Structures are given as structure tokens and as C-alpha cells.
């Protein structure tokens with residue numbers, strides 16, 4: 001019942017209830033004549049919502065907000081982008097125009113600036129060192145160290161045991177490394193181990209793209225990263 005590319009018109013968003021007061025959002029985007037799904041997180045914060053990641057661009061992001069307004073009907077007051085690439089910050093202006101406070105680490109803000117990407121307004125302090133964790137309302141934010149990118153964060157919802165790995169975690173179907181231009185291949189397995197050691201109790205693991213699963217997505221990503229490392 002998890003939405004895939006074939007059930008999502010490009011420009012539309014679906015929401016998927018993972019657990020109580022936790023949803024993934026699913027959008028699609030064309031890239032290089034391919035069509036990819038993309039996940040984000042929505043977490044109930046009392047009477048308001050915390051959004052994790054944009055829906056990969058302004059049009060998708062406006063559809064996401066409209067879809068939240070329709071299906072949940074609670075206001076999105078804050079949003080966190082998990083790394084500086086366009087699939088996570090693309091649409092930050094749309095959120096901002098709708099009165100959402102947008103957040104990212106100084107690391108992510110710096111890299112987005114350098115990249116010429118949209119720049120979330122507010123800064124998340126205390127994530128600069130590997131293994132750093134900080135509370136952000138109904139979630140914990142964790143910097144495991146460099147993986148898909150030097151700045152990538154993961155999000156844990158303690159109340160629901162939902163780990164959102166963002167693009168540092170691959171779904172099981174993805175058997176080869178994705179787009180690794182900005183990755184730290186050498187540090188990626190160690191960063192996944194930090195996630196393993198810090199959240200052994202996670203029941204649900206949501207990858208940045210594709211199907212959710214359990215904690216084996218961590219070991220899976222390790223396996224894939226290592227196979228890529230050994231390309232010859």
C-alpha cells in the first residue's frame with residue numbers, strides 16, 4: 001500500500017501514515033529521462049506539524065502543503081532540511097512564503113549557499129560534530145557524520161520509533177550506489193554504525209527514496225556503499 005512512481009502524477013504528492021502522528025510524504029521528479037520517487041517526513045507537534053524535507057521543488061512543495069491542508073488540516077509551523085541538495089531544500093521558498101520557519105544546520109546552509117540552492121532561514125546549533133544529537137520538538141536530530149553528503153542529518157521520532165534516514169539510507173531495491181558526487185564513501189559505513197549504535201530500537205526505517213522497512217536498511221546501505229567502494 002506504499003505509494004510508488006506509477007501511482008503518482010508528476011506534480012502531485014501522497015501522504016502515508018507510518019504510525020500515529022507520523023506520515024511520510026511521497027513526490028516524484030524527473031531526472032535524466034528517469035522518474036524517481038522521493039520521501040519526506042511529517043510529525044505531529046501537538047496542534048501543529050513539523051515537516052522534514054521539501055517535496056523536491058517549488059511545484060511539488062506547494063502540492064505537499066495543499067495535500068497537508070486537505071488530509072491533516074493542521075498548520076506546518078517548522079521544517080527541517082536534512083541536507084543541502086535540491087531534493088531536500090528545493091521548495092524552501094514556497095514553505096517560507098506560507099509562513100513556515102525553515103531550519104537546517106550551518107553546515108547545510110553553507111553548502112546550499114555555495115551550491116546556489118535555496119537556503120533555509122534558521123540554523124540548527126549543536127550538530128557540527130559526528131554523533132551529535134539535539135531535540136527538536138517531537139523528534140531527535142542526529143548528525144552521524146559524512147555519508148551521502150558531509151552535512152546529512154537523520155531524524156528519529158522517539159514516540160513512534162520511526163527513524164527517517166533521508167538520502168544517507170537506501171531502500172532494499174536499490175542495489176547500486178545512487179548519486180555519490182558529494183558523498184564521503186570512506187566515512188559512510190562508520191556513519192551508519194553511529195546510527196545503528198544510537199537507535200537500536202527503531203521499528204521503522206524510511207529511506208530518502210522508495211520503500212520503508214526495518215533496521216536492515218542500515219546494513220543494506222553499508223553493503224551497497226562498500227560494493228561501490230570496491231568498483232574495479
Ligand SMILES: Fc1ccc(CSCCn2c(-c3ccccc3)n[nH]c2=S)cc1
Pocket residue numbers: 031036085086087167174178179208209
Ligand atoms: F533508485 C534511485 C536512484 C537514485 C536516487 C536518487 S535521485 C537523486 C536525488 N538527489 C539529488 C538531486 C538533486 C537535484 C537534482 C537531481 C538529484 N541530490 N541528492 C539526491 S539523493 C533515488 C532512487
Ligand SMILES: [Zn+2]
Pocket residue numbers: 083085148149167
Ligand atoms: Zn543529495
Ligand SMILES: [Zn+2]
Pocket residue numbers: 101102121122
Ligand atoms: Zn523565523
Ligand SMILES: [Zn+2]
Pocket residue numbers: 087166167208209
Ligand atoms: Zn535524495
